[PDB]
Amino acid sequence: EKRRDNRGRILKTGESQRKDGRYLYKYIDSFGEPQFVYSWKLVATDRVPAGKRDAISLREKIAELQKDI
DNA sequence: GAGTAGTAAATTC
DNA sequence: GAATTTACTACTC
């Protein structure tokens, strides 16, 4: 009934979590084909499993798509 | 449009 | 020195 994270936090539509537990944000772009955006942190404050690469939380990537990239 | 599973390729501590 | 991540589609509701 609702998309939950790998713990107990509620994710917003469009967002979810791959199979590795990382966050994923799929969205139909103006091209006519879904777009994959990867991220381990839902916000730029959490952390990331050791061995994983660093990146701005999906909320920061998304903010670029909604603002003006 | 929303999300999943599987993969092809390249990269990293 | 080995193990891991990314990208798109295909199918589904």
- Angle at A22 (CA atoms; ends A25, A27), nearest 5 degrees: 10
Which CA-bearing residue is nearest the C1' of B3?
A16
Of A9, A8, A40, the residue nearest A24 (C-alpha): A40
Q: How far is the CA of A26 from the C1' of C9 (A)?
A: 13
- Strand duo A34-39 + A15-17: pairing: unpaired
Measured CA to C1', the nucleotide nearest A20 is C5
CA–CA gap between residue A46 and residue A42 (Å, rounded)? 7
Q: What are the structural domains, with CATH classification, of chain A?
A: 1-69 (3.30.160.60)
Residues 6+ apart with CB under 8 A from A6: A17, A21
A58 C-beta neighbours (distance < 10 Å), count: 23
A10: which 2 tokens?
A: 């509620």
